[PDB]
Amino acid sequence: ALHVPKAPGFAQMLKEGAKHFSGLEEAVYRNIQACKELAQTTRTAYGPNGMNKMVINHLEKLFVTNDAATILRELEVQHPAAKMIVMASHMQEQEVGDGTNFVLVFAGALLELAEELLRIGLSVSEVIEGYEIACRKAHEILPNLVCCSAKNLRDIDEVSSLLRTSIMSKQYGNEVFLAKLIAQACVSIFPDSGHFNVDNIRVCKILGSGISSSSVLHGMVFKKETEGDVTSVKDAKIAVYSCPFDGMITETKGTVLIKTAEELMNFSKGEENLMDAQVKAIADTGANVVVTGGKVADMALHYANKYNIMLVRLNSKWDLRRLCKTVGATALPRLTPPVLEEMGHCDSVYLSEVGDTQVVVFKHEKEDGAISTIVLRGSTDNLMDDIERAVDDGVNTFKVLTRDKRLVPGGGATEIELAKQITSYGETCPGLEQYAIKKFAEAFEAIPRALAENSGVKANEVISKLYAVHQEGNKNVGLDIEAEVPAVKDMLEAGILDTYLGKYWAIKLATNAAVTVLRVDQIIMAKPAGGPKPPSGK
Amino acid sequence: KKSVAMHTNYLSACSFTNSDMQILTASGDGTCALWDVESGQLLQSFHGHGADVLCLDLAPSETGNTFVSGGCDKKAMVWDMRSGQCVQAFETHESDINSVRYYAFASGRLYDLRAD
């Protein structure tokens, strides 16, 4: 009478390292607790007043940021329910590009209130159906909350105003400068065709001068140096080659068969003459700049220097393709001279030094082109990485605006209005699902509450004032972070707006993740293996 | 196989000569030895290099007449079949040269025969 044996059946048949969790208390409450803890970890970075977090991964790599997706990526999350929440956040990042922290906060609030509802007596299925009904109602309501539209995208001022809010949550101190930069970069891209490519915006990070010195370049910047002697060209006629700048060789096997003295004495001279003829044939077309994707031979370099040809060697094939898009050239597979259609033209190619790094710049002059580059300055690599993340968020916001031009008020105005109308709808619905609908409505309060907490004011006062104002009939009133006391203001005049697609997708994904977590009833975890990562991840 | 096994001490390295007629061996006493595969006689034993040899390299362009040997004497010294003498030696190495690669030859320091 001093030990409790394992129950016969599955308990004894379980493996030595496996774990089995079954039932409400063992599985659902634990999953809800883990998701709530993850949301608590990521909460403090929400909003413009969010605080940066230094996250160090297993490779001692710094990550100072307030981007929820990046923080979760660099965190070694182990709880599988938190893994679903992180996957939902990453899916939101992939689909839209912004709203990951919204996904975390909404999922955490939904799961907390689901735990409350399960405690008070509701079943899991009833909570799930109420959540789904409330999500459908919210998606029905959301189009009616659209305040304004982009109504143009080729402009600079209003595009910058639209993009300001997206990059105001991050880099809160100086967002107008970044908004202008990203607006210029995006307007250079996005031609008459409605298709907008995010990858056409390039970010170059050069250290030393502070982020206020960052600029936008209508071209491409490579951190390389010219192979030859020429370092500047004013009327570039770039010819791009995907082959090494050398005489091509047989693919099977090369063997110089010598049988007489004359052949031995003439072979090298003839090879050099052939190289010279090829280089001169390339130069005779007017191509004063040659870009190659492979190595550069010594004789080829010498004969290129003889004819005043600027050489740039690009190792990455992605860089070669991007340069071809920027200049308008075709990467020739052989070393033949390019025809007039295959020769790219750039208004200026030269070697320059920015700060310390030597760079090669393919610079246009027209306010157009296939690819635009943003050169980022700064005093720290981490700071430039954070600015790059902000630029990525702004570009994704511009792409979303190209997809859908509708906007909704930010700063919790949309969330508060949604909560009010969902509560009003649920007050009329009979049955047990009304509790779940009301809890889903209340879960929207976590956004303005988080904004107020990060801003440093009393959340309850802000929420009560927001309800009062929205009951008065003002649907565009949100938290005013430019105050030391709980205050609200109209966000349409302030220009604080969020994309309709972002809110729609974030709500949908958060609700889906919450109901998927709630659906789990039993957990069977294998013993954690010591294998060096799955073979799928290489 | 040759399997001669005429040796009082162990063999640090048994390098078959590029010419397909004879073998070159160095015992544990630091003396290299040349054996004829066909006849079996020891053509000549190379004196000097008191510490045990550790690597043997024949000439690469056939020329089965010169080779370089190095061991625990911190030495890189070159021989000659036609005279049985140390024609060239080196002093840069200072620690028990393990392996030698013939280019000049690189041992572990790239030596050049044309300039010592």
Partner: protein, 528 residues
Amino acid sequence: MMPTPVILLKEGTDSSQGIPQLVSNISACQVIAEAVRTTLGPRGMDKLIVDGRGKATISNDGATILKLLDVVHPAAKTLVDIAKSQDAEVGDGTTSVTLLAAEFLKQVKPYVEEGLHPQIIIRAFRTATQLAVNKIKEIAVTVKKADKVEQRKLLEKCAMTALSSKLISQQKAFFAKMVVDAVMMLDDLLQLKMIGIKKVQGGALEDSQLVAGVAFKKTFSYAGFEMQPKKYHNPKIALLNVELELKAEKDNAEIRVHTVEDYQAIVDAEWNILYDKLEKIHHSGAKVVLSKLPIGDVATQYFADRDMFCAGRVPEEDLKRTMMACGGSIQTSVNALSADVLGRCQVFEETQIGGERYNFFTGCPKAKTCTFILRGGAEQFMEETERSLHDAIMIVRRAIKNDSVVAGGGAIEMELSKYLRDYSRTIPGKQQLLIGAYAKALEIIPRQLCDNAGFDATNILNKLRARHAQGGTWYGVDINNEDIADNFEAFVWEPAMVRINALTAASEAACLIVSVDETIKNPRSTVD
């Protein structure tokens, strides 16, 4: 907390959040600043750091000292990063950036401790930095006369000021004259690789020389080299990238013959190929032959027989400098050795410098390159002399780009502190305390100068504050006379961009450090 049978993050994850972690970050930044604190000023001292391998580095450079320090604190790495940034963009002031950032953080640590919102501090820093940069641009002294003599004097004074904190400060005028002369001969890009830095052991600092041309160490001469003449009075230099050796025609080449006549013909053909290359080089008219690829003993003897000079295996950068000095072109083929691609120098000579043989190419009238030959009693001595000369060269290049100067010795920062205090005394008041803290933190550099010099920092700071308040912009610390003086009249000049970049980087680092509220450290993977 609770065991939580299944946990959220991986075991061993260490997290720190709240005010205590920010205070710890500020303390770490203070610790980093302490390690370079005594290296600032003409009375600064060197630091010695030994790595695991046993090699010692002696340097007065803040960036070098910080890099040799292996900092692992996440917040402390920001100071090292901004020091590297200052070194890259400017090249001087790598101690001032760290001192200013740490002083900013130390000044705002008390306000952090009562729970002030970090965003307010960040905004105050941004506003103060913008105002300070604008003031620096406004009051910086510039001369719009384009006088060559005045420009040379300004460059020399800036180089002297940048050099009067190192071990070569005793010969600071002489080294500054070298640096200005070397920089003025670069053509348009002021590329650093076009200035050679050669360190030869032995000799005093006054034995160091600047070569109006190119010089490099003798490179593994072959047999018969000593028979070549070692002095020419109007040589023509052949810059080649060619292997003058008896070797296989190609790696994949293979010769098949079935007659002894063809065997002899092949041997004579190889010899004739080598001799044809050599004969072309000789008939080109050149007397000095330099190649990047090895030059064999046969070619060495061939050139010795013709009273010619040969030097193979020359480093690529040395060949480029020889190009920029003599004015030739590196040829991978000798089939067309015209007079256009042949270098020309007035005098070529091989001499002995401290037990080493060096080749000299002097007399170049249109040289676009230089070569510093540094003499010293130890390798670390020459290394630190090179670092100081690099600082001076970067300063002179920046001054060439824009000759906007401000007085040193902390005068500019005392003026900035007075201006910022005057501005802060006219604002609502929550930002006023933070801007006043910024202005007070701006006083660290003159105080550190006084502390390093053995002064009394409080009295000197009081006198400086009174002088700036009553009128006077360029009054700073006078190290020699234990007092203050008009540093502009004392020719203690710095480029304005040095202080601009220092303030910008320090403010950015302080804002980034303050903006962090939580630090998370994942457990180490593959500890091995």
